[PDB]
Design a protein around this ligand. Structure first.
Ligand SMILES: CC(=C=CC=C=C(C)CC/C=C(\C)CCC=C(C)C)CC/C=C(\C)CCC=C(C)C
Length: 279
């Protein structure tokens, strides 16, 4: 166990801590690719939770790395991750701009006001997850064209959207609603009310209307999975398929707003089999 290794293993710990689904999937990659993904997840995880002196530190470390990839830096933030990322950046191409978007997006959240329109919601989704998918693109593809970044973005955005959908109650508890004012009003939904009195027909419909957007985006990515390298395809199929499965979970929980639903490891394993079986 070198020193890099320990850094990467911390990264890995973080990812497995916070995303049982993506770990499950992405741990099935070649060693080189799965390490890179650990580093990037961790950096992003670190920014998402960073909340404000830490976040500028993380931005500064990343600017360092981008300017002078092959210098030693005294990282202000988390040194274990920045080394792991710096190591990646030496061998692979990192969309630094996408990190800066995510960072920007996370600033703006300290004064979160509700989105006026779906457009704003989809634009948050980009900043929060579309950005991640872009950062990962060079890792999961042999040759990176515009439609490679496009797909991975679309996947990223839809997964974030599936997040929102699972997390509706929890998010309300933390004084956040991600459904847009225009869509709430059109569908006649008061999220405060549903939280108290259970679900109804108007909620289900709004929730089902977003769900439709996700499933559709998921399908659109499956039919373009080829843009990713051959080892990564079934991995990315898996990750996505597990995450759509989250939607049927919420349905069986009757769209509850008083627990995180989950896809038990056995189901995860079932799906790896279905997907693996046709590769
Ligand atoms: C938790 C989970 C997921 C979490 C988050 C996700 C996302 C943020 C997707 C979008 C983000 C992407 C592409 C990059 C990540 C980095 C940032 C967005 C900064 C599913 C697995 C279940 C767990 C770990 C236990 C939870 C308990 C239950 C399900 C009962």
């Amino acid at each position: 166990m070198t020193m890099m290794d320990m850094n990467f293993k911390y990264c890995h710990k973080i990812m497995k801590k916070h995303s049982k689904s993506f770990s499950y999937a992405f741990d099935l990659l070649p060693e080189d690719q799965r390490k890179a993904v650990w580093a990037i997840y961790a950096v992003c995880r670190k920014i998402d939770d960073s909340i404000i002196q830490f976040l500028n530190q993380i931005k500064e470390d990343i600017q360092s790395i981008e300017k002078y990839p092959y210098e030693y830096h005294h990282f202000q933030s988390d040194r274990r991750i920045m080394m792991a990322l710096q190591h990646v950046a030496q061998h692979k191409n990192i969309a630094f701009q996408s990190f800066y978007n995510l960072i920007d997006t996370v600033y703006k959240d300290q004064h979160f006001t509700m989105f006026e329109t779906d457009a704003e919601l989809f634009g948050y989704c980009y900043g929060v997850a579309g950005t991640v998918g872009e950062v990962l693109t060079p890792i999961l593809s042999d040759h990176e064209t515009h439609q490679t970044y496009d797909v991975a973005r679309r996947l990223g955005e839809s997964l974030q959207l599936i997040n929102i959908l699972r997390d509706v109650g929890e998010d309300f508890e933390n004084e956040r609603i991600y459904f847009s004012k225009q869509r709430l009003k059109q569908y006649e939904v008061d999220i405060a009310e549903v939280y108290q009195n259970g679900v109804n027909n108007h909620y289900i419909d709004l929730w089902e209307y977003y769900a439709a957007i996700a499933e559709k985006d998921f399908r659109d990515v499956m039919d373009q999975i080829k843009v990713f390298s051959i080892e990564a395809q079934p991995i990315i199929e898996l990750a996505a398929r597990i995450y759509i499965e989250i939607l049927d979970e919420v349905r069986q929980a009757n769209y509850t707003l008083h627990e995180r639903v989950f896809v038990e490891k056995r189901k995860k394993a079932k799906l790896f089999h279905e997907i693996n079986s046709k590769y």
